[PDB]
Design a protein around this ligand. Structure first.
Ligand code: HEM
Ligand code: NA
Length: 249
């Protein structure tokens, strides 16, 4: 909602379609879907609505932004994508990274998130410190996703479900291990695990646990644990919004 997507040329559209295919094959083969989803989220998640700065505009590949502590390990993601990006010189990096995030969800069996091209690469990275802190709680989540990004409480819970794929690494954030028993499968297991308690071998961040005790977040966790279809619908909506922050309005 509220979006007016720009016109891109037929050749640009052709390149998007071909890049989508190539990204599917590459991401599946390399087993890097979760890392690519993290990359897309960290690129988009710097948007501040009050200043209209940051967001998914290709700045994450700048050495200055990759050096942000919250971005530890994302240099791997950028390097992995560089050879493929080079096959699509017409595409913006911004579009390519957001397309990679959409593909990461699709190949792991998640919903089909709508994608619209036309993000323009911006010259200057946003200041460090906008991304969410895993050690903080609900107030902080609302500060970051709500007050800065302009997303809803529903979006916060659905997007937290991105942790259904992948793992933390002690050398990156310091946290360690997968949230789920099937970390390459995009399903509602993140929420099922969050409800069932601390199972040995599985990770819960303080920011994940914050969802269980918040009056608004908890009913959403309950809904998504009970209804994977409802999770997929809300997730697709939220991911689209995240990927389009500051873009096309
Ligand atoms: C809600 C606030 C969030 C917090 C506090 C948070 C924090 C973290 C942390 C600490 C890690 C581990 C990084 C590492 O050590 O390798 C991580 C990984 C990850 N995050 Fe988030 N995140 C949040 C939101 C999101 C969102 C919105 C998405 C996308 C929808 C997402 C997708 C992922 C994925 C897929 C991984 C796994 C990366 C891998 O396997 O290499 N996260 N997150
Ligand atoms: Na999973």
């Amino acid at each position: 909602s509220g979006k007016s997507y720009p016109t891109v040329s037929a050749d640009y559209q052709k390149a998007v379609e071909k890049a989508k295919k190539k990204l599917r094959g590459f991401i599946a083969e390399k087993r890097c879907a979760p890392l690519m989803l993290r990359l897309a989220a960290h690129s988009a998640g710097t948007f501040d609505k009050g200043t209209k700065t940051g967001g998914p505009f290709g700045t994450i590949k700048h050495p200055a932004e990759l050096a942000h502590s919250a971005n530890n390990g994302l240099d791997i993601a950028v390097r992995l994508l560089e050879p493929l990006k080079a096959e699509f010189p017409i595409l913006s990096y911004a579009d390519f990274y957001q397309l990679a995030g959409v593909v990461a969800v699709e190949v792991t069996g998640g919903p089909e998130v709508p994608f619209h091209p036309g993000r323009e690469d911006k010259p200057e990275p946003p200041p460090e410190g906008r991304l969410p802190d895993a050690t903080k709680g609900s107030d902080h989540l609302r500060d970051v996703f709500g007050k800065a990004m302009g997303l809803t409480d529903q979006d916060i819970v659905a997007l937290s479900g991105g942790h259904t794929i992948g793992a933390a690494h002690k050398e990156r954030s310091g946290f360690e291990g997968p949230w789920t028993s099937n970390p390459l499968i995009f399903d509602n297991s993140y929420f099922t695990e969050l409800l069932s308690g601390e199972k040995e071998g599985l990770l819960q961040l303080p920011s994940d646990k914050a969802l269980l005790s918040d009056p608004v977040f908890r009913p959403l966790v309950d809904k998504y644990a009970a209804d994977e279809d409802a999770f997929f619908a809300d997730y697709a909506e939220a991911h689209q919004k995240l990927s389009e922050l500051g873009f096309a309005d």
